Design an enzyme around this catalytic site. Structure first.
Site, PDB file in Angstrom:
ATOM      1  CD  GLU A 174      27.512  -0.326  44.479  1.00 39.07           C
ATOM      2  OE1 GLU A 174      27.652   0.930  45.086  1.00 39.07           O
ATOM      3  OE2 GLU A 174      26.472  -0.918  44.599  1.00 39.07           O
ATOM      4  CG  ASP A 197      28.263   5.102  43.987  1.00 39.15           C
ATOM      5  OD1 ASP A 197      27.586   5.081  43.221  1.00 39.15           O
ATOM      6  OD2 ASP A 197      28.592   4.030  44.527  1.00 39.15           O
TER       7      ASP A 197
END
Length: 518
Positions: A174, A197
């Site tokens: 990600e 994140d």
């Protein structure tokens, strides 16, 4: 064909495609550029996925399924799984040592699903969204996973892809995908970029160098069971206890009550990103009584402060692992839906002594955007420009040596693909099988790390103890997934069998076939 990029999130998913020289994030049939990671089965037997599934949660909670990203690649006895179960309305049962999901699919008919099958349904919906936009079938995808996902969680995500009828060409971490969204087309020399994140269910931090389309992860760290879901559970628990104090009554096992509270807690959290108070309003909460309460931003923050503060430890670790100071960070890129929470933004800013995060990044879409760019590269599209990614394994892989000691094979933060070979032998005369347990983690002893798998080197010819010389190779591929092979150094190939808690070949074939019927 056209390769799509899918961000498969805990609470929301997002699909993009690189077309005509740029990324297009694709809106679903209701006009939304993100889709809830929700599935449901109506009493009449209709399968709902996405917005329609989420919208009917409170009227049909026991047959509405979500949170599958926090169930895949885990065992039933994982304390994190048992924590989530308390706030999930659908039945979770132990099958093959793992949490499987039992629901009513319509007309009183029970059905049991692996959590990979729920994620496959979400992937199918994202695929369908892309197909409607493109006017053609989508067979290939790049799918995202948290940087801190372990081997089982990665493989389970690939298996979800297989069950959805997708060829998953690449699993992309990600924060790496988000870094592409930040850094694509920038010519700004070499910069140190910190990606923070924090999504609906998992937390990652990665430090990258970015230089004219070359992205290299130097270090990563996180927690795959820390995000929006935890913050929602804290607020749900607060109001469950508030009601207990007021009335003396426990609502925890009333699914309609608890999930109505979930709905309201989500809306309040969103409102508290711009307001300092919000109203929690439920018309028929429990035993004919309504529920009408206020949540202040200060209370929301107080209930979650320990969890919010816990995000700085992984940031500390990535800086140490990269041999960098806070002042070496050139940009801070915030991604994931929970980075909209004002207190999270404040804590990151204060941790970096007042440094402002990068502008122009939608935290809900940046990961999908990067995935779509890498999908463009893997489709041979030259308009992506030169795009080189060097990513790492998040966890040290090791084996057990005498005294329960974790002995390293491949250290954390090693660039993948990578391999390590080691010679093994037998402990007793004529031993036909040598068993090797591989562990993931940074703790001194194997019992405090995660068991990746049990590998049996079989068909070892009879010989005295210590005489056989079997070279075992441990290879992590570009997806971050381990393969183990063996060669007799004394018939060269040694047959290895493994147990890594994966869906069996029979399960996958059955689940692929069942999905095709829908």
């Amino acid at each position: 064909g056209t390769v799509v990029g899918i961000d498969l999130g805990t609470t929301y998913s997002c699909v993009g495609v690189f077309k005509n020289g740029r990324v297009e994030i694709i809106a679903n049939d209701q006009g939304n550029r993100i889709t809830p990671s929700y599935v449901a089965f109506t009493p009449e037997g209709e399968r709902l996925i996405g917005d329609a599934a989420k919208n009917q949660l409170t009227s049909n909670p026991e047959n509405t399924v979500f949170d599958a990203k926090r169930l895949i690649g885990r065992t039933w006895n994982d304390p994190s799984v048992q924590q989530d179960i308390k706030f999930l309305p659908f039945k979770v049962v132990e099958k093959k040592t793992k949490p499987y999901i039992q629901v009513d699919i319509g007309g009183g008919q029970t059905k049991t699903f692996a959590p990979e099958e729920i994620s496959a349904m979400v992937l199918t919906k994202m695929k369908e969204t892309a197909e409607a936009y493109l006017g053609k079938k989508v067979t290939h995808a790049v799918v995202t996973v948290p940087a801190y996902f372990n081997d089982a969680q990665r493989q389970a995500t690939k298996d979800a892809g297989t069950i959805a009828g997708l060829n998953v060409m690449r699993i992309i971490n990600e924060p790496t995908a988000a870094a592409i969204a930040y850094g694509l087309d920038k010519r700004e020399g070499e910069k140190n970029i910190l990606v923070f994140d924090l999504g609906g269910g998992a937390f990652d931090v990665s430090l990258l160098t970015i230089d004219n389309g070359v992205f290299e992860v130097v270090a990563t760290n996180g927690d795959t069971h820390l995000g929006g879901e935890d913050f929602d559970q804290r607020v749900m628990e607060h109001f469950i206890k508030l009601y207990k104090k007021k009335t003396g009554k426990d609502v925890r096992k009333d699914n309609r009550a608890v999930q109505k509270l979930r709905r309201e807690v989500e809306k309040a959290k969103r409102a508290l990103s711009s307001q300092h108070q919000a109203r929690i309003e439920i018309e028929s909460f429990f035993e004919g009584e309504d529920f009408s309460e206020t949540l202040t931003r200060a209370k929301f923050e107080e209930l979650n402060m320990d969890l919010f503060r816990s995000t700085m430890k992984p940031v500390q670790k990535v800086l140490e692992d990269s041999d960098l100071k806070k002042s070496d960070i050139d940009e801070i890129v915030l991604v994931g839906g929970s980075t909209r929470i004002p207190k999270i933004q404040q804590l990151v800013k204060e941790f970096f002594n007042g440094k402002e995060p990068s502008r122009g990044i939608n935290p809900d879409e940046a990961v999908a955007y990067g995935a779509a760019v890498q999908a463009g590269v893997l489709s041979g599209d030259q308009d992506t420009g030169d795009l080189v990614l060097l990513d790492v394994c998040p966890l040290t892989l090791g084996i057990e040596t005498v005294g329960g000691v974790m002995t390293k094979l491949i250290p954390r933060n090693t660039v993948v693909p990578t391999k390590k070979s080691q010679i093994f032998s037998t402990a007793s005369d004529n031993q036909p099988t040598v068993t090797i347990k591989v562990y993931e983690g940074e703790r001194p002893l194997t019992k405090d790390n995660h068991l990746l798998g049990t590998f049996d080197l079989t068909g070892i010819p009879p010989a005295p103890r210590g005489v056989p010389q079997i070279e075992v190779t441990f290879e992590i591929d570009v997806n971050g997934i381990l393969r183990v092979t063996a060669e007799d150094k004394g018939k060269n190939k040694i047959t290895i069998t493994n147990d890594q808690n994966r869906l069996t070949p029979e399960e996958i074939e059955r689940m692929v076939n069942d999905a095709e019927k829908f």
